[PDB]
Design a protein around this ligand. Structure first.
Ligand code: FAD
Ligand code: E0T
Ligand code: CA
Length: 445
């Protein structure tokens, strides 16, 4: 039985643990945090995530999709809130097959941990990786007190998130060629209670967005009709725009309330605990990190956020990490040796990681005239050639097309629409048959 040590019992690490353990690998998984399945008197955790077809399919292959979806809220469309216009519900597709799922992160992690243990993995909590000695094949772990314990390893999977210690250890024995692109937005998680969301008729089966240019809020539903709201706002006001809002201007929760009342007036009344959430929840940081290599020989590999931190604006980070886990287990299972597997994994996944990293950054702008007309012509082309003209968002979210192919086809589509609408003011002026022939010329089924 082949041996593997996984660092991080998050989303990627627990899935890859299950996939390898059920294929007969001897799997030990090490997690810095306590076991979330051991109920304590601590406050619950209400962060949720959008699960799309890529993540769902990964869970399906692992036999866990049914259990996860039973605890998830269907989101049938995007609900865009702008003051002065009623909320506009933009359906994701023609029917409920094209939806995304709002799942509580803690509940998803618990289901995955059970799945990993059911397949035979051993999971060891309260042990955080501190360092790796690659030449001696040993690693050093410790609890929160820092009491150190050493373990031998044969294959090390770094599934330990965007601040990966495995990545830090690798960067010392190989040049990972890291390129860090900091994101100026921080984020803050806020809460809408079930009573408030019902009082204001907030639609439960939708993803909600309050755009406001350089900042915005999103809200995702929970099973009990509460919503988790996330504010995205610059950490600092730019020099050469020092008045603009930023976390630095919001000195306390009362300042945050004044900010919401002015900039997000239909949302502020739903946020009963704004002042306390704002002061008690930490401001998060965002970034894009691109690595030239993801592995050290056959000894260690990164996946998930450890390999490709991305901005969250496409809701694909977890979905990508679960897709990584499937791919890594597949390569390891069937390769000639571990070094071959890890090289092949990296070669397969790196172009797609770059693509979603880029599309996630682009997606922020797109959710921040000419646009209507292009989107209108695109809807017609999707009706005439539904196997050829598929909106990029739909390729990313509702299909398993490799992200880089989705991005390439999306650019062909966006250029074709922009050129077709240029020098036209309405659609009856446009030759739909000529556009369709360009679709069938440039977009294979
Ligand atoms: C605000 C926000 C919103 C998001 N929304 C979405 C969304 O809607 N949909 C989506 O698909 N993605 C979303 N994402 C992205 C998603 O959260 C991540 O991409 C995903 O959790 C990555 O999974 P992972 O298993 O690689 O890492 P994680 O889920 O972070 O798990 C890493 C694990 O490693 C552990 N760990 C860390 N360091 C060590 C160490 N030294 N030793 C041992 N254990 C360690 C951690 O405790 C954790 O258990 C969002 C991200 C943010 C910030
Ligand atoms: O229509 C969508 O799928 C949509 C709009 C906004 C998002 C999103 C999802 C997860 C995390 C974050 Cl930050 C965002 Cl902005 O998803
Ligand atoms: Ca420790």
């Amino acid at each position: 039985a082949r041996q593997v040590t996984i660092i991080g019992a998050g989303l990627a690490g627990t899935l890859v643990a299950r996939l390898l353990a059920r294929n007969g690998w001897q799997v030990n998984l090490f997690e810095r945090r306590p076991d979330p399945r051991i109920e304590t008197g601590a406050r619950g955790r209400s962060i949720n995530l959008a699960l799309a077809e890529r993540g769902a399919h990964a869970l399906r292959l692992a036999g866990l999709e049914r259990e996860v979806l039973a605890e998830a809220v269907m989101m049938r469309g995007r609900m865009v809130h702008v003051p002065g216009t009623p909320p506009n519900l933009q359906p994701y597709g023609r029917d409920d097959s094209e939806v995304i799922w709002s799942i509580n992160r803690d509940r998803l992690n618990r289901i995955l941990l059970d799945g990993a243990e059911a397949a035979g993995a051993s999971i060891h909590f309260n042990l955080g990786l501190d360092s790796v000695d690659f030449a001696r094949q040993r690693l050093t772990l410790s609890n929160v007190s820092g009491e150190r314990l050493e373990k031998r390893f044969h294959l090390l999977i770094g599934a330990d998130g965007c601040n990966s210690a495995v990545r830090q250890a690798m960067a010392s024995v190989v040049d990972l060629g890291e390129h860090l692109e900091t994101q100026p937005h921080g984020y803050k998680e806020l809460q809408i209670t079930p009573e408030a969301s019902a009082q204001f008729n907030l639609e439960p089966n939708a993803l909600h967005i309050w755009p406001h240019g350089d900042y915005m809020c999103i809200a995702l539903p929970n099973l009990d009709r509460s919503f988790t709201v996330t504010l995205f706002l610059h950490h600092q006001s730019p020099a050469a725009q020092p008045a603009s809002p930023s976390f630095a201007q919001l000195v306390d929760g009362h300042a945050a309330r004044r900010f919401f009342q002015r900039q997000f007036p239909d949302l502020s009344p739903m946020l009963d605990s704004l002042e306390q959430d704002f002061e008690h929840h930490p401001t998060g940081k965002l970034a894009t990190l691109r690595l030239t290599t993801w592995h050290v020989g056959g000894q260690a590999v990164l996946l998930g956020d450890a390999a490709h931190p991305m901005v969250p604006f496409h809701g694909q980070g977890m979905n990508c990490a679960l897709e990584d886990a499937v791919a890594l287990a597949e390569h390891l299972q069937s390769a000639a040796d571990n070094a071959s597997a890890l090289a092949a994994f990296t070669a397969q996944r790196q172009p797609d990681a770059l693509a979603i990293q880029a599309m996630a950054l682009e997606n922020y702008v797109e959710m921040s005239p000419t646009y209507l007309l292009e989107r209108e012509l695109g809807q017609i082309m999707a009706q005439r050639q539904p196997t050829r003209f598929i909106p990029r968002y739909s390729m990313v979210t509702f299909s398993r097309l490799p992200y880089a192919q989705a991005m390439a086809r999306g650019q062909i589509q966006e250029q074709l629409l922009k050129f077709a609408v240029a020098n036209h003011s309405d659609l009856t002026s446009i030759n739909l048959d000529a556009v369709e022939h360009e679709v069938t010329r440039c977009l294979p089924p």
